[PDB]
Design brief:
Family (chains A, B, C, D): Belongs to the xylose isomerase family.
Shape of chain A: globular
InterPro entries (chains A, B, C, D): Xyl_isomerase-like_sf (IPR036237), Xyl_isomerase-like_TIM-brl (IPR013022), XylA_actinobac (IPR013453), Xylose_isomerase (IPR001998)
Helix content of chain A: 40-55%
Keywords (chains A, B, C, D): Carbohydrate metabolism, Cytoplasm, Isomerase, Magnesium, Metal-binding, Xylose metabolism
CATH class of chain A: Alpha Beta
Catalytic activity (chains A, B, C, D): alpha-D-xylose = alpha-D-xylulofuranose
CATH superfamily of chain A: Divalent-metal-dependent TIM barrel enzymes
Number of domains of chain A: 1
CATH architecture of chain A: Alpha-Beta Barrel
Number of helices of chain A: 15
Bound molecules: D-xylose, magnesium ion
GO molecular function (chains A, B, C, D): magnesium ion binding; xylose isomerase activity
CATH topology of chain A: TIM Barrel
Strand order of the largest sheet of chain A: 2-1-10-9
Number of strands of chain A: 10
Oligomer: homotetramer
Distance between the termini of chain A: 19 Å
Largest sheet of chain A: 4 strands, parallel
Structural class of chain A: alpha/beta
Amino acid sequence: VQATREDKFSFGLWTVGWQARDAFGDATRTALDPVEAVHKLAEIGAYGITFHDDDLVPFGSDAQTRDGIIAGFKKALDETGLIVPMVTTNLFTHPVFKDGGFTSNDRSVRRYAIRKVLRQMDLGAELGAKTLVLWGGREGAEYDSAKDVSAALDRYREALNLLAQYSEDRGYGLRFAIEPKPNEPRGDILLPTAGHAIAFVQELERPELFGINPETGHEQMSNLNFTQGIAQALWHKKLFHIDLNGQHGPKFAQDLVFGHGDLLNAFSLVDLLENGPDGAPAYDGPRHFDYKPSRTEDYDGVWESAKANIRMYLLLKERAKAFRADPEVQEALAASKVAELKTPTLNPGEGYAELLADRSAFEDYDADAVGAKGFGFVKLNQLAIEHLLGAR
Amino acid sequence: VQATREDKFSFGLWTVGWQARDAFGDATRTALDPVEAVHKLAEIGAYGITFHDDDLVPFGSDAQTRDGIIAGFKKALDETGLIVPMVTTNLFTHPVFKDGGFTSNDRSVRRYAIRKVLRQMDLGAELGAKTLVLWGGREGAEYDSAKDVSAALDRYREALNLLAQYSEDRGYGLRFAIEPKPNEPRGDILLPTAGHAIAFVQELERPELFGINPETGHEQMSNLNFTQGIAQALWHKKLFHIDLNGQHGPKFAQDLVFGHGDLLNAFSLVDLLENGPDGAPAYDGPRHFDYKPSRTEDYDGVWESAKANIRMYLLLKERAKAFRADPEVQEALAASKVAELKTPTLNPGEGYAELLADRSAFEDYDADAVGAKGFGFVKLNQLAIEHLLGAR
Amino acid sequence: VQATREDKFSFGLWTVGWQARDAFGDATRTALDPVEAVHKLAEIGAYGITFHDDDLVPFGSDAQTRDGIIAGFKKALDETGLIVPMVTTNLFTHPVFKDGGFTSNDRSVRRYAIRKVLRQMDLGAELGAKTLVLWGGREGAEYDSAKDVSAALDRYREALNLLAQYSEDRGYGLRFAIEPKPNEPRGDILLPTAGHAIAFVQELERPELFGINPETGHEQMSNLNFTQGIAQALWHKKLFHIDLNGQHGPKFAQDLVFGHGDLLNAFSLVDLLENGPDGAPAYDGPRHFDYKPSRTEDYDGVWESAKANIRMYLLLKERAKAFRADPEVQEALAASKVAELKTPTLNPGEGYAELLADRSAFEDYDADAVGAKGFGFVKLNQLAIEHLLGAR
Amino acid sequence: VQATREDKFSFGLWTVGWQARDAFGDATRTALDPVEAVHKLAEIGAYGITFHDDDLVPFGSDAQTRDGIIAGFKKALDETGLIVPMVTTNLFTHPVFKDGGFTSNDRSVRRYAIRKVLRQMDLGAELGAKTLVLWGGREGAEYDSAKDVSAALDRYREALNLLAQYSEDRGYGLRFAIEPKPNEPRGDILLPTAGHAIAFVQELERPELFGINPETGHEQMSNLNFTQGIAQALWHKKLFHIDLNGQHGPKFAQDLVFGHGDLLNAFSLVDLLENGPDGAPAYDGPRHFDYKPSRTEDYDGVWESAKANIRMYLLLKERAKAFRADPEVQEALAASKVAELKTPTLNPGEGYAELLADRSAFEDYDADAVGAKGFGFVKLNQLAIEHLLGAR
Ligand SMILES: O=C[C@H](O)[C@@H](O)[C@H](O)CO
Ligand SMILES: O=C[C@H](O)[C@@H](O)[C@H](O)CO
Ligand SMILES: O=C[C@H](O)[C@@H](O)[C@H](O)CO
Ligand SMILES: O=C[C@H](O)[C@@H](O)[C@H](O)CO
Ligand SMILES: [Mg+2]
Ligand SMILES: [Mg+2]
Ligand SMILES: [Mg+2]
Ligand SMILES: [Mg+2]
């Protein structure tokens, strides 16, 4: 298969542009020119590109320099037809952000963090971005007594309400997506899982403008089921964006190509997103790859890895489709009663009074006979994997 | 120290009553008589006792027997002065619940599960319990294609809405506390963390009636920071109850005595609950121990372990207070700017307009000079620990 | 695909016979008759069966009963053509073993544990078993001060040395396989990984009679790479047996069907065992499945799951074979220099002096130029997954 | 309590000198001068300093320069009375080492890797170092098909055999300590745990010359019991060196001050190393701190964190001593039968024939009765924790 613009595959400038300087060594690749990155991505089938302010315009560029970069950038976008669906701000690299951006203990840092973001929202709005992703990588602590969490949540909320206000007043029409991460670079990061971020979002002044940007490896860093948390984000209707990559359980963030980590969870994730209710996908935003080409590769490996993300997604999609169109799979689904969960537990108009009145729900319930019937889950799982394996 | 009824130490009947049949071996202790449990707990300092329907009255007891057990149980409470602060229902042991109670694929099981809880609500209301704890230990899956998470959340919501309705109509005045757990016994449990559980509760019909009951070991099974999650729960005002125990990271649930797992986090937790604002505790509910006396122990080890839970809490309490009262700590807190996080980022009346006008927050901000100053967090952490070791 | 006796698939009687009594609930299935298990396994394609003494003869059976049971079992093997490649002893279920068998702090328990094993060695030898597997599930601790590890290792050794003495003297010709596990049921188990078990065995009296029996899920419980661990065991020539199953990282032991956990690792594993040096497998023993049919299944689900194991292994083999046979893979392997690791670093007869005199190895070496060439690893990896997916 | 040269506290140049440039941000501290480091460490009580070649002499310094630095360094040593107990080689930072040093797929890098170490050996020899630590941080892989584990071990062995040859011919008297780590920077590193490294070492040409250098945090990254692995290392007599620091379970390596991660395990570890065999320490080498001052700290924080390491050790030592001297602890130890484990299971001159003849070890053994007695382990654990908290 081949990717179409309708597939909505996007990449961060910082993914294919990662120079591969890790915590233990020097960069192994030279820097990637943004215009060149735009052209190469267009060529492999991406529909959009995203970036942190500091990825495009070097921190501290004078206004003439910044303007020049932006103009050349826009020309590339123009010529290739690529769009900018989301933009983000780097609030983690500069030493000033060592204790966080919006939640640094230092008040002045909190004021500067908000200004850095407002400036990025202007540029995002001018490039046509619809989503602002917020990754508080430095909001957290290494020691419990160093950070008042409650105060931190108050400050977090205080910054986000201002941003929504500015956006709404300027008519930018942006949606905000908080991206959870459990740890790294802080010992413990605030809003550690998709769940924590969703619960926080619900407390903002204008919750409807806020959702989450969950990343495959981030949830896997806590050994949580990514597809299942995505299912819950979809139930809340807070899946505003998604970051796809690979990870091997709890360890530093690996940022492997999507599907190269937990293959079976990648498979069930693609099934969830594309085989939504009513034939159609359950999610329609970008399919964004927030990964890193391995430190062992050169620029050839970089493009190979960019293309592997898309191939992985399309192969899994193909297998998820065949899975569902298989009359044997359908028969197994029926035997396992998956769909029966979709039927209300109470009858139409039944309340507690009528339930209490139904002796078949208790008094005459044969728990023991029901308890002995098998659900056929293993067999269902086996057919799923045989589809993934191309054995069916 | 010594426990008083104002400490509000409570224990589940299933804790000290655990016979020690694990996944790999037979019970090493005989059954504990509930009346005796009441007496023994009263003696060590507990102010209350809790239980699952099935802990007190054997599954499938005739009306006569059930009635008989309750009446003796009420007498023991009477005689001893212990209260029943919370009650819970067993929706995990019987084979009928193998796929869950409220979210079983099987509709007849969901109906039966609701019935079983209504009944315990009645008994709870009758014994004076204020909280209904809901632990969905069988809600989840081993295989992704076997459970429609969205439909399961619908069914979970549907069942809770009804319980609230009933309680309000009967005038029981119960609060409901959902208890999250990431896995075990299901491969993946629905509402895996305190975060996911708060997000969910917010979607119910009468959200003001629902909160969570987080357990130390559950969050640690995912390697999350328990104290930090409780601080978030308190920020949301959803800390309806708490289960205290010990765990050594991502592994099977150990249920050790509180403070026998992650000692540093047990210290910071006690500090957060007790050294609340306005001198007073940030949390006023029961300090409930949901732990298990090790399988290597006899009834003496059982009472020894019960007392250890109390002693650990009180020794930590004593050190958390000394910590906060130390002038050197006060000096370290100041240098760390812990309290500066409580001052709003914006001056009263400032909005984005005024922030944008402040050159000092961006254009004239010296990020480099600010980034060079240390926060003194290591020194502050070292002082906390020396207080914990009784070295200061 | 179809299983042959040459595939050497074996199953423990305790696998398909698991009644599904976990730590949180009662059994969901009835007991399986050993004779019936023998007929069913023979039928699905297994070549052998294994058992714990207590799986076949109920703990405490008189010799009359014991003898009768062995006779019937023996007939079933007879009629079916199944062999007993390995036997093991249950040193974890009975309460007496709450602190271990061989390493219990109680001296009498230690004497008893040895006797229990000698007896099982006798039955093993009578049935033609070649391997005695030792899983020290209760050897370890929940608390650091409770167990002197050094003393424990001395006692583990003392017991094993006696066992080898006896087998050698009785001429049984058995091989001993130590099975490592990090935790569960003890907080921490002695000899937690394949590495620790191999190091320990090297200290026995007759080390050549000892090896390890690593289990997929056991290594994965610590988030280790099972394939890489097996590779090391093979390098040492200590892979005496292997237990195959599935797990999803650090959590309770799941015992899923082989390949239903880390699917990518399941693939590299079959490749390692099967595409050994010169076409031939790198491993020759039994391909033993030590898994459990999920608690949600009935006997139908049980047989299904038994066959899924065989199915998974044969589908994987088939793709591992195709992977290696692919000229494009062959080309990618060359570009990544995988085979160049086989060439000695040193020239023939070259020592320190010749190497120190070689200017090209240091003084005149261009590290920067070599540091920039890519290894093409992502591309090789993508080729492997495409073969797994049946897309190549 | 104050540090003495007898305490043998040592620090790597790279610990206090870490500029806090992490995987997500720029350096927050300026470079530390080596002469300065020697002077500051001498002042806080360190008896020795260690370094990688590249920490002292910048990669690629001409001889004049290198020679100059060493002379200055030696002078500082001289003046302060500090020794160099161990030296190591940086085989991980430079891009040439991206796939490993000794086990890189590239033959030329392997050759260069050996030359770089020989050179460091000469310098170590020159400064009087006794141990060569080898941390194979880049040895491993991100993908299973990229690395032939078997060939890698052959090449790891080939290189070490040569180093020992050279040391021995030259009369250097060095001991070699392999340092295990499960992951980071590589997806999976070869020789991941203490166990894997000990097993490997037993296979070299002069094994007596090889041991391990386990690091607290590295074992904890896999959720292993650090104290328990050290106990096994001591049993094998392979604990040649130790790296002390703190970690919070499986996540990126935190490098916290010793005792700031798992405090209970830090306590059991000091007890193990100090309350050795006679009354004397069980370990006689350097107590080396391989940690990193948190990125949030300035140079005042750096010196505070250095001192914290020594203070945690001395405070734990003091409580470990008190624990063992307590009569109540003695009594708990007696009730738990800790010392009974040190008595041979067999009576002197007893073999399998005598054991088989002992009816009391089996035929007349009352397992039910023994299984009912408790070990009193919780109580023993409780007294240990109370000693730790200075509560007794
Ligand atoms: O772990 C890195 C984060 O995922 C980052 O890439 C965000 O997505 C955007 O700042
Ligand atoms: O992990 C077991 C659960 O904690 C259980 O004890 C509940 O709190 C009550 O159903
Ligand atoms: O985790 C359980 C063990 O794997 C066990 O089944 C052994 O292999 C045999 O005692
Ligand atoms: O994880 C960092 C390593 O521990 C390293 O510092 C070694 O000990 C020396 O190379
Ligand atoms: Mg991301
Ligand atoms: Mg609980
Ligand atoms: Mg096994
Ligand atoms: Mg180290």
